[PDB]
Amino acid sequence: FDADNSGTPEYKRVMEDVRLSLIKKCKKVFKPEFVNRIDKIGVFEPLNKKNLHKIVALRFKKLEKRLEEKNIQVSVSEKAIDYII
Amino acid sequence: SVKDIKKLIEEGILDYEDLTENELRKLAKPDDNFYELSPYASDEKDLSLNETSGLTNEQLKNFLGQNGTYHMSYDSKSIDYAKQKKSEKKEDQQEDDDGFYDAYKQIKNSYDGIPNNFNHEAPQLIGNNYVFTSIYDTKENLIKFLKKNSEYDLYD
């Protein structure tokens, strides 16, 4: 959780090992007939500040859209995003 | 002229050099929270006592004193015993917080003459007289005053 900003293969070794275990976990709980019927299964990664810099950025575009009755434009510095994070 | 008011004026207007002798004496005495009864202490995990410690062997100390071309000084039984019993406590330790959140607080208190779980105001000899500091009010700007300016001359 604490560090995901690395794109090292050490995460990819861990990322494959936890995906294969959830396949076994879905095979035991979620009735293994579902496993071969469902197509490609993707485990989402825990988010990091490299993704979260854009995730916070789209919200202020949504903040403009719900203020369209009020016409209050909001724009956020790149320094201001990291202080929010 | 009152103990509490002068430290509110130290940031604003007046410095530390212009105080009275009876004002420097009063500002180093403890506050009114001292003498007020409060019988409660918590977090009895102190770094002062070592649970791995043992008696003087008096045969090893005889052997280590003769310089004996030896290869190990300490006894290493009780300090491997504490390593073994730590293996099974669990992940419940949440290590390096006691390493960081609790080690560095208790080290800085030992620099101020404060015991580890001691939540009250503690003395330390600065020059010729004592200064009662605590965790909460460190009185660091007084310690800068009574060390630097009080090298040659005397203040009470």
């Binding site: 293969p9 990819k12 070794r13 494959e16 | -």
Partner: protein, 57 residues
Amino acid sequence: EPYLKIGRSHTLYTHITPDAVPQLPKECTLKHLSSYMEEKLKSMESKKNIESGKYEF
């Protein structure tokens, strides 16, 4: 071959100095092997994990 001759050599152990011992060639000291393991895993290890999951034709 050079090391074998000294064990047959009728010398006392007191006369066996570092000089009488020939130096190992550089492959044989741990330095080399140690530096071999700087290379042999570390670079080669991530070559296994690259190209693993791109899948494309």
